[PDB]
Design a protein around this nucleic acid. Structure first.
Ligand code: BEF
Ligand code: BEF
Ligand SMILES: [Mg+2]
Ligand SMILES: [Mg+2]
Lengths: 219, 219
DNA sequence: ATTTCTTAATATTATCCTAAGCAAGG
DNA sequence: CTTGCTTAGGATAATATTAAGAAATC
């Protein structure tokens, strides 16, 4: 990923850039709030490091702005201010960790590591075949791109046939996918709800499997 | 927004629990790894807090199993084991922060407030859906120009609804979000309380999704 | 001494099922 | 001639809506 580092001390700033590289992050770094602003506006950064002791504009105000400016990225603070209130206020200004100087480098490498692992998979499990985009995580389906009203039975069938889409699903799989245990119905609802899915205005992407079951369209 | 607090020092444990409540979270404190684990199975937690010094099993061991079983929950260790080898080893295991004992409950409130600012929504408050301004730190919701008089459960429910806004939030979520452990109510609590949020002007901004929980709408 | 929560007992649907006839697969 | 399709008022289980008397909370 791409880290940006921010340090008023030059010897330090280089030491960091180089360290962040030893670990293998593509890394830029700067000694000015202004330049930090220009580089943020320039590139994409997965993580920021900071100092509150910036010479041009105070770091806290820069963070205040950065998120006020609706740039939301993880921001680690690495600072000389170990005052309790400083930890507090920083952490409350949108700062996702606070590391006091003097510090050990392997710690900073770990805190950054953890911050990034959390940042890393925010990914939503998704399945889209055709117009349909099924969101396993959001429980949102889209005949692309529009809302799909789905009763729980409808959604269960759609996602079972979406997950297996294109290779015919056997009838018993779909039946059980709907009513658990004592809930088992006597007649003709598999067909009723398959009918309803087909009636979504999405033009029958279900092909009927003659022997047993039903299948979904592919391309 | 219901925390689990895991500790084996009694006095401290009750204190933490009562403190977490004191901020407006809801909490289940436990004394050990098995209790913790079973408590993971049953309920749904916004954040957990961990101790390594448990008599049961070592907090880390549990964190390895937890996070290896793909429990994506944000952990925050807090322990009496301060060595740098300890914190790096803890973080890599791993936890989304670590804080050493002793400490000010205020640093803990700050790091947690932050950690959740990260997890649930991205970056910073305020989450704003439609005209509603929801500020995580200030505990206040605003409808357009004005504010709302929101009961605690009202604020928490609307909070979890705006966090996930645009997506239907399952019932069990809002439930576990409101009620801590022993305080689980037996009747109608959801629908009534939601009926009150709804009756607070802005209806209908909450779509009931049958078979599921309730969704918020931004368009 | 207000304010906020929980309990029922209520009233209102949304979603599933009831078959029973009509389409075809084969 | 067996297997899937379509048709709805009508049963079911889910949420809505109350109003009052518990708890909290001041
Ligand atoms: F002066 Be900075 F906080 F390192
Ligand atoms: F005793 Be525990 F590790 F704080
Ligand atoms: Mg400085
Ligand atoms: Mg301990």
């Amino acid at each position: 990923m791409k880290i940006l580092v921010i340090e008023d001390d030059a010897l330090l700033l280089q030491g960091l850039i180089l360290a962040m590289q030893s670990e293998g992050y593509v890394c830029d770094g700067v000694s000015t709030a202004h330049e930090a602003a220009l580089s943020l506006a320039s590139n994409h950064y997965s993580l920021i490091v900071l100092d509150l002791g910036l010479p041009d504009e105070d770091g806290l105000h820069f963070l205040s702005r950065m998120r006020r400016e609706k740039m939301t990225q993880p921001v680690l603070i690495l600072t000389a201010r170990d005052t309790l209130e400083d930890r507090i206020s920083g952490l409350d200004t949108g700062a996702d960790d606070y590391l006091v100087k003097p510090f050990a480098l392997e710690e900073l490498n770990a805190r950054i590591r953890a911050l990034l692992r959390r940042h890393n998979n925010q990914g939503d499990n998704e399945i889209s075949v055709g117009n349909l985009r099924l969101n396993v995580t959001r429980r949102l389906v889209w005949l692309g791109e529009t809302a799909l009203d789905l009763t729980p039975k409808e959604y269960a069938l759609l996602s079972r046939l979406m997950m297996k889409a294109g290779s015919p699903v056997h009838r018993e799989i779909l039946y059980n996918d709907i009513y658990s245990g004592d809930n088992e119905p006597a007649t003709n609802t598999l067909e009723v709800h398959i009918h309803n899915l087909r009636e979504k205005i999405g033009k029958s992407r279900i092909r009927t499997v003659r022997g047993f079951g039903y299948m979904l369209a592919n391309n």
